[PDB]
């Protein structure tokens, strides 16, 4: 036989003269049918808006967003089956790490899309010019890549410190063990020191953070707006076009700004060029502009590269080179951001960027409020767990309020798709749609 030493928080809850079970048949099945339509529910979202749905930069926010919460519905059905034996896990000790994990990484993984989110439309407000040149749908799947592998980063720690514990009634407990690798000279002091490391670095980077961001970037933006429509009802700015000073301060700094929109600065690389310059000298002021965001897109390598499209541009041919452009790699790979421009081409007439006002912003409001309803009773009771070391009064309400908590952040991943739908009529449609086709084919 062997024998862990473990924390005080750990012993009182490994003692508290009989093995038979009580079994909470109510929580089983409350916690059966939570698993069934989590998986039916985000499972026809994914694919509603990731197959018979245009695809957007917004969309794949919601795409990636939908397939956290179908992995955390996935470990659900395995809790079902832990209250169903009374307590008790009892799938070996490698699953009970793994199990564990899930919860965690659509924890840190719905924090940072949160994030994401809040601040795609931050940018896409705050510096337009830069936005409407880079903002493309393959950048929106590459974001999310990093995010998940730091998704992943963050919660190595609680798969390493997860442990299955024996008690003294024939339960088997899955839960923390911070004394099962490298415990210093004072258990007492690492007990302490790296629980309190656990629960407060949980509830910055994955809630306190997002909340911060999320309405940091939610200012920004309104402020920007009441400008902006300020400018639009001045009769001067009618046909004024790619604005940068709605910030305000100088424009000297220019060629240092992040998210740069330096347009003076491509100007001089345009003349500077001996491809570009009468090209430029030949089209009118709305057509330079067009000019101006190719150069911003591909740089100034790629535009001379395009020798027959700059010949008919130069010749006012504009019909025979949107033919001519619609068949390049740059508008294959980039629909939305080049079909701008070889249309302003065409017609000669400039389409606002910041005339287009955001989408979704129902459904991000709501997820948000149902984000903010089930993480936020959990990291209250959590941090309290962490406390709880040197407070020995606080114990018996911790056993009582975070199974409850904990469940309900459970629930956060069938809330998320009625509220898709609520939220987006599109999405809505899109479902009926799909749903008559399926029942019709039957019949
Ligand atoms: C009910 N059991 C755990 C409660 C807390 C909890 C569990 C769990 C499983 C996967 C992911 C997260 C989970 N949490 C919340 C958390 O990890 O912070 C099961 S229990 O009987 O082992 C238990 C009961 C009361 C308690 F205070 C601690 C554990
Ligand atoms: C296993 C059961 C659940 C399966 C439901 C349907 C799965 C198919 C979902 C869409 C697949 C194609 C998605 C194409 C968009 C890619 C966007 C992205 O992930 O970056
Ligand atoms: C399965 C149990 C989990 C349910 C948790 C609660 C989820 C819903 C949370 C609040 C949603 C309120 C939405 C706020 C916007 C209201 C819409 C409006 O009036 O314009």
Redesign the pocket.
């Known amino acids: 036989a062997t024998l862990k030493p473990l924390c005080p928080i750990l012993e009182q ?1 490994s003692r508290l003269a009989t093995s038979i079970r009580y079994i909470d048949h109510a929580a089983v099945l409350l916690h059966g049918l939570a698993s069934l339509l989590g998986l039916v529910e985000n499972g026809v979202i994914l694919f509603v808006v990731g197959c018979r749905m245009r695809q957007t930069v917004v969309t794949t926010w919601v795409l990636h967003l939908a397939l956290s919460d179908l992995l955390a519905s996935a ?1 659900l059905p395995f ?1 079902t089956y ?1 209250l169903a034996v009374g ?1 008790s ?1 009892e799938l070996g000790t490698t699953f009970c790490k793994l ?2 994990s ?3 990484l659509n924890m840190f993984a719905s924090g940072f899309l949160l994030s994401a989110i809040s601040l795609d439309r931050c940018l896409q407000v705050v510096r337009p010019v830069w936005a409407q040149n880079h903002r493309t749908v393959a950048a929106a799947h590459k974001v999310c890549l990093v995010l998940w592998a730091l998704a992943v980063l963050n919660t190595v720690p609680y798969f390493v410190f997860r442990d299955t514990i024996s008690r003294l009634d024939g339960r088997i ?4 063990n911070v004394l099962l690798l490298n415990p210093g000279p004072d258990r007492d002091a690492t007990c302490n020191s790296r629980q309190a490391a656990l629960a407060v670095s949980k509830f910055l980077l994955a809630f306190l953070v997002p909340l911060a961001i999320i309405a940091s970037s939610h200012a920004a933006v309104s402020l920007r707006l009441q400008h902006r429509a300020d400018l639009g009802l001045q009769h001067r700015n009618i046909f004024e076009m790619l604005r940068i000073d709605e910030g305000g301060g100088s424009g000297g700094d220019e060629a240092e700004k992040l998210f740069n929109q330096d347009v003076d600065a491509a100007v001089r690389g345009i003349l500077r060029n001996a491809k570009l310059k009468p090209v430029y000298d030949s089209l009118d002021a709305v057509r330079r502009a067009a000019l101006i965001n190719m150069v911003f897109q591909m740089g100034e390598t790629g535009v001379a590269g395009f020798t027959n499209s700059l010949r008919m541009l130069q010749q006012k041919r504009w019909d025979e080179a949107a033919v001519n452009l619609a068949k390049s790699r740059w508008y294959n790979q980039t629909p939305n951001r080049a079909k701008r421009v070889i249309t302003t081409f065409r017609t000669g007439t400039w389409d606002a960027y910041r005339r287009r006002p955001g989408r979704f912003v129902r459904l991000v409001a709501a997820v948000v409020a149902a984000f903010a309803l089930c993480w936020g009773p ?1 990291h209250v009771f ?1 941090l309290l ?1 962490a406390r709880a070391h040197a407070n020995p009064g606080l114990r018996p309400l ?2 009582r309020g ?2 409850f908590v ?1 469940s309900l952040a459970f629930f956060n991943s069938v809330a998320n798709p009625v509220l898709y739908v609520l939220t987006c009529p599109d999405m809505l449609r899109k479902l009926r749609r799909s749903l008559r086709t399926v029942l019709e084919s039957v019949l």
């Open positions: 809850m470990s809790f832990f307590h896990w199990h564990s899930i919860f965690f407990m899955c839960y923390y959990y959590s767990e911790v056993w975070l199974p904990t």
